[PDB]
From a paper:
As we had engineered an HRV 3C protease cleavage site into our protein, we could mimic the furin processing of pro-activin A in vitro. SEC-MALS analysis shows that after the cleavage the pro- and mature domains remain associated with each other, eluting at the same volume as the uncleaved protein and showing dimeric molecular weight of 88.3 kDa. In contrast to the uncleaved precursor, the cleaved pro-activin A complex is highly active in the cell-based luciferase assay with a half-maximal response concentration (EC50) of 29±3 pM (all the EC50 and IC50 values and their s.d. values are determined from three replicates). These data confirm that the refolded and proteolytically cleaved pro-activin A is correctly folded, homogenous and fully biologically active and that the pro-domain has only a marginal effect on the bioactivity. The structure of the cleaved pro-activin A complex was determined at 2.85 Å by molecular replacement using the precursor structure as our starting model. The linker between the pro- and mature domains, with the protease cleavage site, is visible neither in the precursor nor in the pro-mature complex. The response curves of FST-288 binding to the mature activin A and cleaved pro-activin A complex reached the equilibrium very quickly at 25 nM analyte concentration, resulting in very similar Kd values of 209.0±0.6 and 258.6±1.2 pM, respectively.
Activins, members of transforming growth factor β (TGF-β) superfamily, were first isolated from porcine ovarian follicular fluid and identified as activating factors for the release of follicle stimulating hormone. Activins function both in autocrine and paracrine manner. They conduce signalling by binding to extracellular domains of type I and type II receptors and allowing the kinase domains of type II receptors to phosphorylate those of type I receptors and initiate the intracellular signalling.
Residue numbers in the entry:
A (entry chain C), B (entry chain A): 51 to 180, 202 to 258, 283 to 299
C (entry chain D): 311 to 354, 389 to 426
D (entry chain B): 311 to 356, 387 to 426
Amino acid sequence: QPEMVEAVKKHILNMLHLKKRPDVTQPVPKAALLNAIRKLHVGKVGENGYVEIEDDIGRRAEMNELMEQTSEIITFAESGTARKTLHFEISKEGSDLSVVERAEVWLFLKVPKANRTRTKVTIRLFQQQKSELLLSEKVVDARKSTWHVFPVSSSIQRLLDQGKSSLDVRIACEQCQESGASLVLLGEEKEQSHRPFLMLQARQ
Amino acid sequence: QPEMVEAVKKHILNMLHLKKRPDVTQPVPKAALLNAIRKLHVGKVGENGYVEIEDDIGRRAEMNELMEQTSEIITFAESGTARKTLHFEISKEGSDLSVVERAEVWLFLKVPKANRTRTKVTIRLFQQQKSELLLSEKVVDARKSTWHVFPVSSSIQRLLDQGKSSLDVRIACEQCQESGASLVLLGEEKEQSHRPFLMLQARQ
Amino acid sequence: GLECDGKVNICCKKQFFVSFKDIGWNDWIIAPSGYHANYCEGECSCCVPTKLRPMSMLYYDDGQNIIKKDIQNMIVEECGCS
Amino acid sequence: GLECDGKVNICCKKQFFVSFKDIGWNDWIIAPSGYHANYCEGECPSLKSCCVPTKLRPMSMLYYDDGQNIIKKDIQNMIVEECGCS
């Protein structure tokens, strides 16, 4: 027991570049100490005495290893065989990943003329099975051409649980045309920049 | 040459959990790729050029090793042998550190009654040698009891360059009393929480 | 990532935690409460630490000096054979 | 930290940089431009010492897994920054 306690003692001292443990003296008053470290944001203090190091570098390393476990996958839409449908072939990397942290579908709504009229349109995403379940129902801004994010974390999670890696999405937007707007489902020439895509971020 | 090029190839592939380099195909249009990674903030692209990874974890490790070389020193004032004077014995750890990044003197100005009159007082810090050079001249708020920070990075730098580790500070504040205010230069009991201190942050 | 538990002999990490109170160091070491002394032992090539984690300490260097330092490779998180 | 430079026998790191263009990998590897293939070779006196990497740095890559799949990954211990004896 003692030979090992002395082993880590010497180890700690070598990391601190100290030949020896500091000699015992009378420290500054605790109120003086706690107040100083609080104001400098080098340490946090909990009532009745407890002290935690603020800006712990160990928490940063614990954070760096976390994003080492998490992978981001960008899956571009492949054109479906049906009308207004997108096909998504998720990378096999998604098999290694068990827990979905975030999953988004990105659609670009093109609005050539900036309208003050008919600002709101309802866009729906349908996952097709065998049957169609509602991925997302979102009311969006139809003022100007912009991107629009659809949260589908629960569905992508459910999909990976079932061992599946494929998603077929039907998109509906009846009010789009009368708003003078259209969702880009296929990357046209110079409009290929607006090709729709799914984002998957999962870990472990 | 080739045996090594193939050696790192296999290493890269093992880290990515790939048995093999991806088969050659036709990728998504570059405009489509660049636009997606931009909006998701996974990658930066600028001026019709190559792509740099935003949120690079290697840039985070390069940051964590920086703060591993940077140390913070809190040096509490010791009561000087003279009137309105503080003595600072900077830790010997300051010898290992060459470059001063930040150095601050912290003084508590006690103001019992909140004045709306005489809001401004001029506080001066004098480093004493052999002769006094002006550490800091700061006009501060005299509304309420509060801390006040004095920037002395250049002086502490010059001090460490000269191989010295000691600082004697005379403090002057003529307008303080008529404002009903007094700088705390000592640990009064129940006021020891306001004991003045020097903060030093240096690297390498 | 192997964890030594008693009778295993392959290269893994032992895990004994040290509290500065039992050591007589809780007076000059303000924070943290203790150090994670994890070490690698066994026979392979050299049973070297493979995953290392930095650590921050808050301690008295003197009666009036406080140090905030960040040490690299302070804690051995995981090891295996080299 | 020791750096191998041509003639030397002690445990140090040699470092050569590999650009994915010269390798034929710059099509599926979007970023970065190249990999820092730093490895440890050398000799340590003999309980033996293996000349193991001592300081490691994680690295993130951006690459095509498929024609329509982009991967952003963060690998630990990808780059060997410094080595010494064990």
